[PDB]
From a paper:
SARS-CoV-2 main protease (Mpro) is one of two cysteine proteases necessary for viral replication and assembly, with analogous functional counterparts in earlier SARS-CoV-1 and Middle Eastern Respiratory Syndrome (MERS) coronavirus variants. Mpro cleavage of pp1a and pp1ab at the 11 sites, including autoprocessing sites at its own N- and C-termini, releases nonstructural proteins (nsp) 4–16.
Further, a product complex of the same substrate, captured at 2.0 Å resolution using a Cys145Ala mutation, is also presented, providing further mechanistic and atomic information to inform future therapeutic design. Possible explanations for this, which future studies may unravel, include allosteric communication between the two active sites within the dimer upon substrate binding or, alternatively, a substrate-induced dimerization. Capture of a well-ordered product complex in the catalytically impaired SARS-CoV-2 Mpro C145A mutant is clearly defined in the electron density maps. For the C145A mutant product-like complex, the C-terminus binds in the same extended manner, forming analogous main chain and side chain interactions. Well-ordered electron density unambiguously confirms the alanine mutation and presence of terminating main chain carboxylate oxygens. One oxygen of the terminating carboxylate sits coincident with that of the carbonyl of the thioester acyl-enzyme intermediate structure, forming hydrogen bonded interactions with the oxyanion hole main chain nitrogens of 2.9 and 3.0 Å. The second carboxylate oxygen is positioned to form a strong inline hydrogen bond interaction with His41 Nε2 (2.9 Å), again supporting a role of the latter in general base activation of a nucleophilic water to form such a product.
Author numbering:
A (entry chain B), B (entry chain A): 1 to 306
Write the structure that this text describes.
Amino acid sequence: SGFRKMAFPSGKVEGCMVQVTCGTTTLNGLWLDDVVYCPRHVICTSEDMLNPNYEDLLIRKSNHNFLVQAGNVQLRVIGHSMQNCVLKLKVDTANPKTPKYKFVRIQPGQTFSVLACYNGSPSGVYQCAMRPNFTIKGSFLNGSAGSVGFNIDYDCVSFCYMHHMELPTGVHAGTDLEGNFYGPFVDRQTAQAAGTDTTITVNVLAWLYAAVINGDRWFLNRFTTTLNDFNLVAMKYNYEPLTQDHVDILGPLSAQTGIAVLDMCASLKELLQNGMNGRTILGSALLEDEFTPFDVVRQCSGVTFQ
Amino acid sequence: SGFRKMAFPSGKVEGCMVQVTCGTTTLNGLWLDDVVYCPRHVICTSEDMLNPNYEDLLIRKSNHNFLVQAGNVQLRVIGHSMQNCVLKLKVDTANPKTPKYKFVRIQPGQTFSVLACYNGSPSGVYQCAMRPNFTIKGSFLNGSAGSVGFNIDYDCVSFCYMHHMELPTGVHAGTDLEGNFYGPFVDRQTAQAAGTDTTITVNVLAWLYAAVINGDRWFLNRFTTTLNDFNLVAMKYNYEPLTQDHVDILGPLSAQTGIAVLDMCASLKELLQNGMNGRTILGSALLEDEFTPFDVVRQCSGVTFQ
């Protein structure tokens, strides 16, 4: 028993972290097979960030300008190319520690683990959610770019995020492993602002099901609702709309607990309109939106009577 | 910027997890050098589990009764002995993945990362605190016994916890790596109950310093306080008394932020008496006590590990 924000074991990803240096700029790279992936702003100086012409800066650099280090070993760069906002450095050696992996682009609301790194070395691991405004509420300092977000499926590592930068509100922006930013952000020093952040409704519902499994049922009511009706109320409280794919995803929890998804939507609707009145849910005064239905399922391990 | 419950990278510990089977009982073991450490209740059956005579059960078992597996490889057990509540199985092979390690006994208030395992395989990693009542508020299911807790400093893994069981309130009990339980608990099915839990004051102060570093400063006040005056208020809110050793421990953060410890104590005193009035600290409506002063330094300075 017990629920916790759990990250995946980081071992498979730690064996892929390298340090990439270009001039005086150092950040983290990801060594998979004979390729090192890293943010393209490694080729920039502080002055270049004001409006960098990346094609032009890359053209002026050669393989010898990249210093890739994997511990006390230098990796010889054989080729280099840019794919969107990521730099790919072909090295002469294939990483012997390369796990089974794939690159995936995640949707807002989905979670992943972050292995925060500095100088090619891991500092810590934590669980994050991709926000509806395409930012992440992470913990990153200068030198953390190149750090990746991932999930593990059996023994396959799915890389879904590479860190690039921090927005003025203290949230983080990055790309998938194909170099494409999540959201409307650019790797240029300009005034950028994240859109209005919204609550991940499907995860609040999953968390209300976790509370029901753990014995917290004060918020439950004998009422039901209709999908569009709920979405109109939720929209007013800055909650994301609940799609039919979200309802399908909540199916296993709904079946186990015997509480239909739309009955839980009516309980959430009452909570939004009346508040919690000093009461808590799972030892929390606020509704949690970074705990997915999958986490609730795998941590409960309950049976579904039919 | 940002502040998260951050676990240590688990890679070094993943290379030490093995599966230990004795009869029909299977749990996790810790393979360091030529020794496998695991809870002694692996030698028990469901019937033994009420009031087991461990000495007698161990006496009636031989090395051939233990099946130790490290992936698709069986490890030969050469010897076996009991040290308090842990079984030590000497194997014929030294773990080639043994990191630099030491066994430590931690104090209440201290945090560590838990690598939750099932059948010798890591499932997830999270950060825990040893509560003042010697329980941990973890996330464990049947088969998680033998999962360990650890901290890292420089390149040395300090193992401080091995999981054994769950108490009737849903909290968890375990031992240090010398087999001694944290708290007044025993490894059998008897009436056991955790004592009254309290808030780890020195950790709440460490977390208020983390908030200040991240620019969340609304709670700061012009008032200062005396130590006994603070303890007289904190005691009423079920907070642990702040000792002079705690003030000394908060010294580096106090110097790093320019805010005296007793100045922060007066801010906490106001927060306890008036509440947060709808405001949050580091996105939290409740005061967090599972970050020590070094957990804050480690994260906000970007300390990395081997």
